[PDB]
């Protein structure tokens, strides 16, 4: 039995938009009990798509501007990018074409990008509604995220909730398929 195909995945996106929980929920089936801002971490996940076994390297990057210097060094041999934003933060969605896309395209032109809408469980969350209401806002819509996906020329657009594990497998199976076409 041959070894699994190796592919490296890098995840980017705004501060606290749910990047780490997404990686851990998928690779360890655990929702991190405590929130700890990431500088840089890496994990290995195992997956099989279309009868092909793949060993996915999960490179976790920092959303914080404080660690912008470190992020570029995590780009080099990336097979697929999971560019994230949170469904409960329209500002995190606005930083997609503003900050994340320009950075990713510069360091990884041609690398498949999956735009991911995190925290899908907060769309109908009443508390989220009242808070966003103050700031004269409301949770991101599926159409808006799908539009932004088209705008940055992403491989696809997916929504998920690391919390309820809803849409998590779909996100990673699509990311793996993209990373395989390479």
């Amino acid at each position: 039995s041959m070894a699994a195909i190796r592919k490296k995945l890098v995840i980017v996106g705004d501060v606290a938009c749910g990047k780490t929980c997404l990686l851990i929920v998928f690779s360890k089936d655990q929702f991190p009990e405590v929130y700890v801002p990431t500088v840089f971490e890496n994990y290995v996940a195992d997956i099989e798509v279309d009868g092909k076994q793949v060993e996915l390297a999960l490179w976790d990057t920092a959303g914080q501007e404080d660690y912008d210097r470190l992020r570029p060094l995590s780009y080099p041999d990336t097979d697929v990018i999971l560019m994230c934003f949170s469904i409960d933060s329209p500002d995190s969605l606005e930083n997609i074409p503003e900050k994340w896309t320009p950075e990713v395209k510069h360091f990884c032109p041609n690398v498949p990008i999956i735009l991911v809408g995190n925290k899908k469980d907060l769309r109908n969350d009443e508390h989220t509604r009242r808070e966003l209401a103050k700031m004269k806002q409301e949770p991101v819509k599926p159409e808006e995220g799908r539009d932004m996906a088209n705008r940055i020329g992403a491989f696809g657009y997916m929504e998920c909730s690391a919390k309820t594990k809803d849409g998590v497998r779909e996100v990673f199976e699509m990311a793996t398929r993209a990373a395989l076409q390479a």
Partner: protein, 86 residues
């Protein structure tokens, strides 16, 4: 944890032919273990979803899923430890 310590090969000459063959066998085993665990996990996810539609407790399945990812972790550490001595 060390697979070398488990096999009593701790301070042995790992470059020797016999040891090199035993390790290749162990790597093959590990690779097979990882593939089996990977499929059990994917199946467990299917069950978790099936249990969700039945309206029953996901606790047992979630625990199995975690135990499965934890096992994959150990298998990867050991496989990594043997790649250094090929």
């Amino acid at each position: 944890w060390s697979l070398l310590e488990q096999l009593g090969l701790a301070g042995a000459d790992l470059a020797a032919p016999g040891v090199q063959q035993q390790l290749e066998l162990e790597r093959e085993r590990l690779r097979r273990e990882i593939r089996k665990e990977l499929k059990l996990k994917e199946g467990a996810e299917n069950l978790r979803r099936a249990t969700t539609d039945l309206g029953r407790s996901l606790g047992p399945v979630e625990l199995l899923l975690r135990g499965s990812s934890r096992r994959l972790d150990l298998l990867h550490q050991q496989l990594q430890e043997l790649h250094a001595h090929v």
